[PDB]
């Protein structure tokens with residue numbers, strides 16, 4: 470609010486507006502989702518890949534009842550896929566919110582439709598993880614999604630869990646104690662990345678991204694004088710670069726698992742380049 474130009478203030482306001490309209494932070498409208506039921510070299514890697522998703526799951530009913538699901542151990546069989554349909558439904562729900570976020574923003578609406586599609590295919594996973602970070606509780610290792618909770622299982626210990634790049638990302642980013650405004654500028658910087666596959670208006674997207682980055686740098690300078698926030702802008706940009714690498718690693722996991730055991734919803738297939746033809 471302090472020290473920004475009028476264009477920078479309008480930019481933050483437009484992003485905060487889009488975030489408010491399209492982020493169901495209580496997950497009140499996530500419903501009707503599936504739940505876990507009550508050569509060989511490709512299989513060996515798929516087994517390791519699925520370790521990237523292993524969480525337990527709690528559901529608190531409006532009546533006060535609690536269901537809890539603890540996932541199995543890997544015993545060399547199909548039981549390792551039990552959480553995939555639920556995870557697909559959750560990600561699909563998040564992805565719809567992300568697509569709505571982008572479409573409310575003026576700078577995005579003004580790009581040609583092909584570049585909108587390419588930008589969303591490139592960034593949807595990243596914006597999803599940024600939104601999930603805001604409901605991550607780093608004290609209990611839990612993503613608190615309203616009536617749903619997804620909890621990390623104690624291995625090993627805390628430091629042995631933070632070796633997994635996705636978890637180190639979530640814990641390190643939560644430690645920065647970002648404002649809502651800083652999360653939503655992070656989303657814009659990731660969304661308007663000019664080097665995503667298939668982008669045509671590289672120069673326009675690059676100039677938009679740079680403007681979002683300058684606004685973030687200035688927001689931090691004007692509102693965060695404390696020695697703990699020295700280099701905060703550069704810390705955030707380093708997190709964004711690391712998030713891009715996690716996106717490539719986790720996208721290849723999805724594709725290997727999909728090859729052995731189909732689970733991607735139609736929206737996930739569209740976002741991740743699955744044509745529907747073998």
Ligand SMILES: Cc1cc(C)c(S(=O)(=O)Nc2ccc3c(c2)nc(CCCCCCCN)n3Cc2ccccc2)c(C)c1
Nearest residue numbers: 520521522523556557560594601612619635719720722723
């Ligand atoms: C295989 C696959 C790949 C991709 C690319 C997708 S996805 O982007 O479409 N979606 C998606 C959505 C949320 C995700 C996610 C993927 N990975 C994680 C990290 C899981 C936590 C570490 C476990 C620890 C064990 N060592 N989270 C966070 C999370 C937040 C809330 C609830 C649960 C998990 C999918 C579906 C599968």
